[PDB]
Design a binder for this molecule. Sequence first.
Ligand SMILES: *[C@@H]1O[C@H](CO)[C@@H](O[C@@H]2O[C@H](CO)[C@@H](O)[C@H](O)[C@H]2NC(C)=O)[C@H](O)[C@H]1NC(C)=O
Ligand SMILES: *[C@@H]1O[C@H](CO)[C@@H](O)[C@H](O)[C@H]1NC(C)=O
Lengths: 32, 32
Amino acid sequence: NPEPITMANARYVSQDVKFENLTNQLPPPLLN
Amino acid sequence: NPEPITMANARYVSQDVKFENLTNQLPPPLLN
Ligand SMILES: *[C@@H]1O[C@H](CO)[C@@H](O[C@@H]2O[C@H](CO)[C@@H](O)[C@H](O)[C@H]2NC(C)=O)[C@H](O)[C@H]1NC(C)=O
Ligand SMILES: *[C@@H]1O[C@H](CO)[C@@H](O)[C@H](O)[C@H]1NC(C)=O
């Protein structure tokens, strides 16, 4: 059941090269 | 031991119909 990525389902983690380098349409936890 | 609600004891969760809808004297996590 796709839901918006918010702080309720995301935690901050360190940099990993296997992650995704989002450049546009970022989720709220990755803004400002 | 009643203590103020803060990030030390409050964890963000998704919306649910069984939670209290608050309008006055909000905890700091729910402000702004
Ligand atoms: C996201 O960007 C980082 C850094 O720009 C990429 O990490 C690089 O990965 C290549 C291939 O393994 C390495 O040769 C580089 O040394 C890495 N750079 C750094 C700074 O560690 C990463 O691959 C990118 N991820 C995606 C999915 O594109
Ligand atoms: C809180 O508000 C939502 C939306 O109006 C409602 O569905 C829910 O029953 C309410 N819950 C309480 C405890 O007031």
